[PDB]
Subunit: 294 residues, 6 copies
């Protein structure tokens, strides 16, 4: 005869399952390769726990996703050991400002840094923020793909990148789309890119470019993207869903995302284009990550 | 001096309580007879845990209530060993469609099935879904009470039951209220019922019957209920509260239910009629199912 | 080419429709017989407007329904000329306290009062409030049906009615259900009722009666209703829907009510009993009051 | 005295009363009607039909997405619909009951509708059958959208069998309708054989990966994989962007004006957007 | 596999399992207990009593504001309460039923409670009578808060008649209790005659402007007009500040450390804040 | 017999009342002296209407309150004629940034400007914003009381004021509390104030002052307020209520505010202090304004 209400009863059964499997699941944890906490409010305490339990392990973490986690500077510092384990680090939509950039800077300067992909989009970094970040990028050798989409850089921000870029020698992809920047800033950076030793791709769409500004960019092999007309197209939609995840019919949003995943698999299967396959597989990555979060 | 916030502090106290009592409550679990998880979102993982901890035990589970649990087909399959333990199985309000009917079908066909009462109301089963369900019912001997209220059947659905019914020989009560069906379907089913070897009671209220349709049914001993206006009266009332529980004022609803519970006790004590009593005992169980769930 | 947004555009079309039809609908207004404003927040200004436009007219207002209107004492005073036109006056769910009882008192004492049915349920009137109300009732001859369900009366309140009742000579029905009262208060009132020259029906269900308390009442022709378990059955059901109307799924509730309405029609047509019919006619009016309000 | 909103209401009345003659003229010369998102009750319906039932111009666009429209409201709104070149009725919970009214709209001698968008309504196969009869006797409609309308197997086979009865249809969207390999194939076949049909959408159905290739390999153009416009059309229906909206046209226009043989496909993908922008 | 929250739950379990011995020690030496805002069901109550029913230290503060506590929960929590120096129970919907349990808490030989905050509970005059009996046999409580507890006329007169039965009460808050001129005056009188009572709060009652002057003109200090601390105490109960919170102490501390004869009143007004800051 | 649902029926009666009283109320409007639209979303269209109907009239508008109106730069420009009528203008909590400051600048430079009190608090003006505003203040002679509480000024912002202040010769009260500014900025401004020809009162509380910074300020007759320990105390509470108005129990919040108003009246009546009376009367102003808004 049951004394515990439904949710309290389930909590209780969880505890027992978790108690009985403690030794087995402890081993499983030390061998994790992926860590998705997108959409959970990472308070100081949760931050502390994640660093304690996962601050060390056998393998690198192929991916660490903390999109939309309401992360602050302090949480960042606490999570440093976990980030040092990461190859891909997603920190989008976390409200990070210049304060947090000092901590990222140190993460990038750290001898143990093995981050190849860093996504900092949809955080109000600021020009001040990026300047600080740039210094970390100056002494880093691991990072090949960096995203700064919609991070409040503006003119000042992009000119700073343009001037400083060549101090990093391994960066391959930089995304600076949607940052309120005008014609000359955009051009200075486009110029720096083409002169860069490693930089293969630069995103400049959704900035405040005039139509003549665009042509100049277009006419200027580091590849400059000035218009949305491919995986990036997708990124920005899925940015919206990630935003509104909590706000929508979960069961519906799940099926939109399942069909889109299926849809992506096949388009990937049925072209032989290397760069097409790579672009789709990227979108597969973002979609799987939203499903998980549901 | 306290470092954790209120809910975080309570979690921590829970863990310690649970840790200290582990041996004692592990024993309590193994001799459970009732399982109410109504209103909790039963994700794959919760499904997995419940199957693991409660998949086996001493006694049958006199009742298993998972109304309003956002259960999918997969979670169903996971939960099959728990369902095989159940005498009474509530799965209302779970968004189950035709997909989930195959799993129910197999549950009903399983040699170990000892389910007597199966409530599937407020799930979009469909005519397709009930066709599949019917096949399971064909090879079942345990189920005596089946509820299909508001399951999307329509004319196609009820005509199907009418044609297939006599393939089951132990069914006593069938609720097909509120299913969008018209006069002839309802009449074909009412006909099949009266010729059925076991079927004692069929519910047809809240369908799309014409006033002449209803008299025909009325004039037609399997008893046919065509109008709500006792145990089913309140069933639909409570079914309604069941949708909206956490979704509106808790304390107020708690008191309404306590007073209603009390009104029913007294009503039951003041009748000698074995039938009336039994009808009322049903409703108290439902009130108690909601009280607990609060 | 459209400049206004959707709702703003609709407002503008409304104005023009209203402007064109001004003379015609002004006439329609002057011969209204019914006034349902249930669910709208009746502020001082809305109160003022309604009094101004409808303070006078040809006919009596067969019914005035202002349930759930967040009405205060002042708005009451404002609305007095409209209330003097009313045969039936619904003021449930308006948060009326003792303050508002003086205004009701005066309404009941007014020479032009022709209110027959006054429903004050779900307002925290209080024993103090009912004392004041009672004085009005003492000098009234129009009111035959009075509802005080869940108005905070308690023992003090019901004892008051018991002592004062016979001062009114035309009252036929009194609902004092769900008022927190105990066995003796309920018994004193039930006693006063049976000795009352006119009082045909007293409701006492959902009070804090003991099971022995209830039998006593039951064993005690003024009819005393001690248990819910027909017209009052649903009253409390609907009273519940009435709280939560816009607050939850509209289309679903619309359909439930349409089907219920329909179930009641048919039930009424299928009984010859003049009493049953009348009970059911009451409930349809209430269903229709909710339908309209949607 | 007047609280803020009530005071604003009162100012509106007076502004509206002083400008009555002037704005009455403006209305009769309206060419667009967007009521997307307002709950169109019987009364609101009645008012719209009264005030806008007739006018000088055709209504270049009529948008009533997400208006909680019922069959009755539909009948009331018919004289307004008859004025419409483009008619949006997405997300209105329209079922088979409403399809009779649509049927009669399509069959009406005055029908001037070129684009009809019925997506995200539970039409059903029963509903589309009835709709198809209207389409059979229509000559105005060139673009029809049936995205996520509960058609399934039965529904798409119906279209495949009945389509060639219409001779002016250019674009048919039947994406996201729960349909499998054969139904999708039947309809893809019918499309290629169709005298007018230039584009068929079949993405987000229940196709197998071999189903897809067959479709792909099969000039009516069949779209089987969303992966060149319909991207938000599927998801934009879930919220029902504050900058992103215009920035796709601001982006696709500055890209429409920098290309030959496929300068057209940029335009009708800009138009699927230019829709949702104001829509 | 594990979704984000479920994965976090699992990490928590493991962190909690590894640290069990260590944090068990930490708990037994807790001195503060704040559960403000969590719905304390029977089970949660039971757990708290089990794990924290006994310990080394007194609990310098126990805060359970806004916890949806009932009478039963109260009884369950008694052994925890007995450990408390300061006990907050505001906003818990406590009525006369609960007052018996409070009464017994106050009468208990082990009662060490100095500050008891019962505001924004519908105690009632019936409730306060019962509470008063407990207060009669209590010696620990120096600060009692009855702000907005439905006392009225009847309630305050009761206090006035019964007060002198307690001899250690220093501060009584009966603000915002719907009481009129005479009740307020009776109680103000009783206070001035009281052996210990240093401060009585009477603001936000139903006093007339002449009532106020009489009170004003009448050393137990009677506060009749909120216009030197209780400012948010009245409104802070409505939300139940992200910077404003600390900035009042950050402001009142840097003002507590720049003054003599009334350096004390800055402190106990800082303490009414220093409460709500963590509370 | 009624055809219109409750809210639609009330709309209809409003229209008729408003139609019948058109001539009378038209006259009333032209003689308005006060305009409170606090808390309504002032869209372009509403802005347009308010300027049309109230762009001119007989009297000055003793007060114009548009707190919490979601006003943009464009709405501001549209509302310019109404603002030119105003003696006191409240524009708090409107999200105004540097963009809007050009429009305020022009409002202050306008020959017809008769604004004495301008409240711009809780808008992210910025140092850039204030610089622009300062220029308008340089050519204004009407404004005696200016509030810039929490407008994102910081160090840069306050130093700008300090340097520019003496260009205005009639300013009496400046509020720059809660603007993230440090010791020297605060001191420079305090210094400028004491040297100012007219400035009687300067608020500097809730800035980032060190305790030694405070003493220096304190030790430094223009009156400098460095700590909250009076009407200003209140302002900032009522700032919170105004914020959360829509979010709270309106009936409750109304009674808190009624009792506080009563409370204020009396404390004003029962001290003879001129400056005390003026401070309370200010709080009376803010409270009455919230009540109205309810
Ligand atoms: Pt943005
Ligand atoms: Pt759907
Ligand atoms: Pt186990
Ligand atoms: Pt109640
Ligand atoms: Pt009139
Ligand atoms: Pt339904
Ligand atoms: Pt702030
Ligand atoms: Pt209250």
């Amino acid at each position: 005869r049951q004394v515990l209400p439904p949710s309290e009863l389930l909590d209780h059964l969880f505890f027992h399952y978790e108690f009985q499997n403690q030794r087995f699941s402890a081993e499983v944890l030390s061998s994790l390769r992926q860590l998705n906490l997108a959409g959970v409010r990472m308070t100081p305490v949760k931050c502390t726990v994640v660093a304690a339990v996962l601050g060390s392990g056998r393998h690198a973490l192929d991916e660490v996703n903390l999109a939309s986690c309401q992360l602050d500077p302090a949480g960042l510092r606490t999570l440093l050991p976990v980030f040092l384990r990461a190859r891909k680090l997603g920190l989008q939509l976390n409200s990070l400002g210049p304060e947090a950039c000092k901590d990222l800077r140190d993460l990038l300067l750290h001898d143990q840094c093995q981050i190849t992909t860093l996504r900092l989009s949809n955080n109000p970094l600021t020009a001040a923020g990026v300047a600080v970040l740039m210094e970390g990028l100056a002494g880093n050798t691991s990072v090949t793909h960096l995203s700064l989409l919609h991070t409040g850089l503006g003119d000042e921000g992009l000119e700073l990148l343009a001037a400083q870029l060549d101090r990093n020698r391994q960066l391959q992809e930089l995304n600076v789309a949607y940052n309120g920047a005008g014609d000359t800033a955009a051009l200075a950076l486009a110029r720096a890119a083409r002169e860069h030793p490693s930089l293969e791709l630069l995103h400049l769409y959704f900035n405040e470019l005039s139509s003549e500004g665009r042509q100049v960019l277009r006419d200027l092999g580091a590849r400059v993207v000035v218009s949305l007309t491919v995986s990036e197209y997708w990124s920005v939609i899925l940015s919206e869903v990630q935003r509104n995840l909590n706000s929508w019919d979960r069961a519906r949003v799940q099926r939109h995302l399942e069909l889109l995943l299926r849809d992506l698999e096949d388009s990937r299967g049925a072209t032989l284009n290397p760069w097409r396959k790579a672009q789709l597989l990227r979108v597969e990555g973002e979609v799987r990550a939203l499903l998980e979060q549901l």
